Nucleic acid binder design. Structure first.
Ligand SMILES: [Mg+2]
Ligand SMILES: [Mg+2]
Ligand SMILES: [Mg+2]
Ligand SMILES: [Mg+2]
Ligand SMILES: [Mg+2]
Ligand SMILES: [Mg+2]
Ligand SMILES: [Mg+2]
Ligand SMILES: [Mg+2]
Ligand SMILES: [Mg+2]
Ligand SMILES: [Mg+2]
Ligand SMILES: [Mg+2]
Ligand SMILES: [Mg+2]
Ligand SMILES: [Mg+2]
Ligand SMILES: [Mg+2]
Ligand SMILES: [Mg+2]
Ligand SMILES: [Mg+2]
Ligand SMILES: [Mg+2]
Ligand SMILES: [Mg+2]
Ligand SMILES: [Mg+2]
Ligand SMILES: [Mg+2]
Ligand SMILES: [Mg+2]
Ligand SMILES: [Mg+2]
Ligand SMILES: [Mg+2]
Ligand SMILES: [Mg+2]
Ligand SMILES: [Mg+2]
Ligand SMILES: [Mg+2]
Ligand SMILES: [Mg+2]
Ligand SMILES: [Mg+2]
Ligand SMILES: [Mg+2]
Ligand SMILES: [Mg+2]
Ligand SMILES: [Mg+2]
Ligand SMILES: [Mg+2]
Lengths: 122, 156, 129, 80, 205
RNA sequence: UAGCUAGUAGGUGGGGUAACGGCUCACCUAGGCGACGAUCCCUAGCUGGUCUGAGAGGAUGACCAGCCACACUGGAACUGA
RNA sequence: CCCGCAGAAGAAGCACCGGCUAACUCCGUGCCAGCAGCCGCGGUAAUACGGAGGGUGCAAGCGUUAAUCGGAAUUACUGGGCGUAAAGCGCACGCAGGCGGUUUGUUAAGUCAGAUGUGAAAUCCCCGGGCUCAACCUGGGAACUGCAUCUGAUACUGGCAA
RNA sequence: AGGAGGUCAUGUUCACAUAC
């Protein structure tokens, strides 16, 4: 309010919490998958979303989404995860970088391949 | 040779006993490009009727703006209900740097070099109203020197 | 408690202009007298005049042009709670030099343009547009 | 000519030494309000002639103690 | 770097001529200069103000053959120079060496002018300049090398530019195939069809 | 995180340092700092600058340059300008 | 760096196309597979999922993720509010603290002006020069909004006296 | 014109179109 009041109590900034805490301000993290399974989305949606329970290298155990059509992931499959959530899926806040250490590229893609790690078709 | 342009077409409801009664409302701004500008709301059951009605209501109800070679005379602060608008006489050749409604209003009024910013709300109706009010409340050296009873060269 | 007589004078002028009074009156002081003198020299008022000795009363005759008041907007800058001092290189323009700004310099009270020509800044008193 | 500071005594309880206050008028950086900050100094008084509430002119000298580096030039306004 | 696709497709998208072809034959004779390219090119949808600003920026870019990150540098330099930013930008674009050597007649199109510049055939102030985006200077001489002066396409392009209009701010002696760049052209001397303020108010987003 | 501090605060004298000085010692006095935030806790090398920003500001301190600190961890001195 | 040789000959990809946002149709699918930055889309004709044709945007790069500023006037000094949207202490008294009716002196602390020293170089900006242009390098200035000192002014604030 | 006396618990969930 008044300058006199601000002098005694200056504006205390609004510190922001990161939406992606278990990455420790790092673009991606390597983790070993503990359990692959499927869940159901929230009320507007209806599907079988494929997720996995990843143990990162910092001891954080998070839940990640597995994009694309199908996968080849089971227990003790080291994968790379990146930020970003999936909304209609309460807990998941990470996407597996498809086309990485163990995540094989989703089969038979033709456009937007780079997002799914698919080599150039001959 | 009045230049004219629509800004926003919206859709509204009435919810009569039978059901919803949708209708469209336009908003258009006309101007000569040399000071004379005006705005008309217009509201009908179809988009062509709405725009025609708004253009007819906008040709009438035009104001006069004291201008300085496509530029404002002095910084102005227009205010309407929820929108506060700040306009400033930028130098030549900088173009119209303005928000949504202000862009149309100035481009049809004739201003060609202006810095703008729309604080408060950004609802197109109130922004148009505030911009036209702010331009209306602008003085030129001639009129201010006449008002104060001095010569323009004295005011500079 | 009346802790700003200059702000009170500006408020009186503004309210009188809004209420279409021909003249306003106030308890005088040698600083309000100087401000009113500057205003009369710049044409924002018709004429000022003091009266009385023990408790002098300053009386201003406001100026209208075509039914609309001459003084569009007027406000105090250097409030007692927060003084304002500008050097010679920051003497602010009001309405890009159309309006004036009363500045108290070490050579009296004068308009911003006159102070800039003389080459010395000082305290600000009010923006008169 | 030597650089001097005028201040007011706060306490003279200790021997051969006085405490002054150097209240100054420094404009606030961000807001512009003219706050009134105060700096306490330990000043070397000889003969213990000073008293609380007295205007004192002081000067900066070589250190004379762990915390004392100023000496007294001339007392003024000894009023109680 | 440079764009290598079909040319008249660009002119069709922009709606108007962009001088991408030699001009020996009428553009409408060469292609449908009215219908926009593609399967859905027949119908015309309304384009927003962002659409028209982008369309003007791309029109100028495709006229002069300049890519985006180079055009943004040109805009920053125009905004940094004193005076009118749009006129400064058009002055720089007209001051490109390849544009100059196209204007004076040593090339059918700006692409051919660029190839002539890049293949060490042009020479400013007696030094061979290999840079397409070289910035010429007022009162400078642009000539073609003695070795390459014998090519046929130079003669053909000279004749083509003869029957076009002649830019008044650069004197061209086609007899010995040289030219003198007089001074930076004015917005009056440039094309009025190039709407200008849109580019500056687009980049100032 | 509300009171903290006995070489602590100041004075006389001896010693010590290239040098002033509780730097150290003996004695004397009871002081000193603190709401203009003392003490305690967490974090952090600092600056010219870099990024952003119309500006005020916000974030930051890699490379280049100035200063400080450290050399497996904890101490200590010698030689020497 | 220059000259000479052969030959178009050795050299184009990535994202997106429901609105925001420049750019649309067909086929496959059928609340499944899936997409997603926000709003959402998919339950049999899907411009939103996958493929194809077409197009748009960037280009030896293009996308995704992380991080900061901006938009955010959304910590508001410039630049907000408090009857009902979040927000006036239940009410008073009052010490620090903030502010101070009018006149004349005096001081010159704040304040303003001028001058000197300093504010390293580099960086930013301006006018030029050199690398074929540019990035880059560089010459001369301007700034480095600051601090200290000296000499002035007395309007306003402050001190002292009446 | 002034003022007075004298029954009824609950409701699967989601779908709802026009924008020159
Ligand atoms: Mg809002
Ligand atoms: Mg010491
Ligand atoms: Mg490149
Ligand atoms: Mg001793
Ligand atoms: Mg000794
Ligand atoms: Mg550390
Ligand atoms: Mg801003
Ligand atoms: Mg820091
Ligand atoms: Mg390092
Ligand atoms: Mg080690
Ligand atoms: Mg050691
Ligand atoms: Mg030694
Ligand atoms: Mg579109
Ligand atoms: Mg997609
Ligand atoms: Mg279908
Ligand atoms: Mg698709
Ligand atoms: Mg902000
Ligand atoms: Mg608010
Ligand atoms: Mg309520
Ligand atoms: Mg409430
Ligand atoms: Mg109350
Ligand atoms: Mg009270
Ligand atoms: Mg007073
Ligand atoms: Mg007081
Ligand atoms: Mg002074
Ligand atoms: Mg420097
Ligand atoms: Mg050069
Ligand atoms: Mg330099
Ligand atoms: Mg005074
Ligand atoms: Mg006084
Ligand atoms: Mg029930
Ligand atoms: Mg029941």
């Amino acid at each position: 309010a008044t300058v006199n009041q601000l002098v005694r109590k200056p504006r205390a900034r609004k510190v922001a919490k990161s939406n992606v805490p278990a990455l420790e301000a790092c673009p991606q993290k390597r983790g070993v998958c503990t359990r692959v399974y499927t869940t159901t989305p929230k009320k507007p949606n209806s599907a079988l979303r494929k997720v996995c329970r990843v143990r990162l290298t910092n001891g954080f155990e998070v839940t990640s989404y597995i994009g694309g059509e199908g996968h080849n992931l089971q227990e003790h499959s080291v994968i790379l995860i990146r930020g970003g959530r999936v909304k209609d899926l309460p807990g998941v806040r990470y996407h597996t970088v498809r086309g990485a250490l163990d995540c094989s590229g989703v089969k038979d893609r033709k456009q937007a391949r780079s997002k799914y790690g698919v080599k150039r078709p001959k | 040779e009045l230049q004219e342009k629509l800004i926003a077409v919206n859709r509204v409801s009435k919810t009569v006993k039978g059901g919803r009664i949708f209708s469209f409302t336009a908003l258009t701004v006309v101007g000569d490009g040399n000071g004379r500008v005006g705005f008309g709301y217009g509201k009908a059951r179809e988009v062509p009727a709405a725009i025609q009605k708004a253009m007819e209501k906008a040709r009438r109800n035009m104001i006069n703006v004291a201008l300085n070679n496509g530029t404002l005379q002095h910084p102005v602060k227009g205010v309407h209900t929820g929108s506060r608008v700040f306009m400033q006489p930028a130098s030549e050749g900088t173009g119209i740097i303005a928000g949504g409604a202000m862009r149309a209003v100035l481009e049809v009024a004739g201003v060609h070099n202006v810095l703008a910013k729309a604080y408060g709300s950004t609802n197109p109706i109130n922004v148009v109203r505030a911009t036209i009010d702010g331009l209306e409340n602008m003085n030129s050296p001639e009129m201010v020197a006449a008002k104060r009873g001095k010569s323009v060269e004295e005011i500079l | 408690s009346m802790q700003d007589p200059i702000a009170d004078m500006l408020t009186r002028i503004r309210n009188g202009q809004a209420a279409n009074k021909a003249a306003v009156t106030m308890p005088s002081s040698k600083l309000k007298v100087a401000i009113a003198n500057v205003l009369k020299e710049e044409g924002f008022i018709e004429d000022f005049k003091v009266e009385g000795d023990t408790k002098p009363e300053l009386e201003l005759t406001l100026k209208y042009f075509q039914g609309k008041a001459v003084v569009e907007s007027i406000q105090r800058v250097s409030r007692p709670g927060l003084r304002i001092y500008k050097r010679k290189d920051e003497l602010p323009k009001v309405m890009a030099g159309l309006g004036i700004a009363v500045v108290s310099t070490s050579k009296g009270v004068m308009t911003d343009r006159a102070a800039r020509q003389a080459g010395l800044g000082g305290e600000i008193i009010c923006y008169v547009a | 000519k030597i650089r001097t500071l005028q201040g007011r005594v706060v306490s003279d309880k200790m021997e051969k030494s006085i405490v002054v206050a150097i209240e100054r008028f420094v404009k606030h950086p961000i807001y512009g309000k003219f706050i009134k900050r105060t700096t306490k100094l330990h000043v070397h008084d000889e003969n213990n002639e000073c008293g609380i509430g007295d205007v004192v002119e002081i000067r900066e000298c070589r250190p004379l103690s762990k915390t004392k580096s100023w000496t007294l030039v001339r007392v003024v306004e000894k009023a109680v | 770097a440079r764009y290598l696709g079909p040319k008249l497709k660009l002119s069709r998208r922009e709606g108007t001529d962009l001088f991408l072809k030699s001009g020996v034959r009428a553009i409408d004779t060469k292609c449908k200069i009215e219908q926009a390219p593609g399967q859905h090119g027949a119908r015309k949808p309304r384009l927003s103000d962002y659409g028209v600003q982008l369309r003007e920026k791309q029109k100028v870019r495709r006229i002069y053959g300049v890519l985006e990150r180079q055009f943004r540098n040109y805009y920053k330099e125009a905004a940094r120079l004193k005076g009118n930013t749009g006129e400064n930008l058009l002055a720089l674009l007209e001051g490109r060496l390849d544009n100059v050597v196209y204007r004076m007649g040593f090339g059918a199109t700006r692409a051919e002018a660029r190839q002539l510049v890049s293949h060490k055939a042009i020479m400013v102030n007696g030094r061979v300049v290999n840079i397409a985006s070289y910035q010429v200077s007022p009162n400078d001489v642009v000539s073609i090398r003695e070795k390459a002066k014998k090519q046929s396409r130079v003669k053909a392009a000279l004749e083509l530019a003869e029957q076009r209009e002649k830019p008044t701010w650069l004197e061209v002696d086609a007899g010995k195939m040289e030219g003198t760049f007089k001074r930076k052209p004015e917005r009056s001397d440039l094309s009025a069809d190039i709407n200008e303020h849109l580019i500056v108010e687009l980049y100032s987003k």
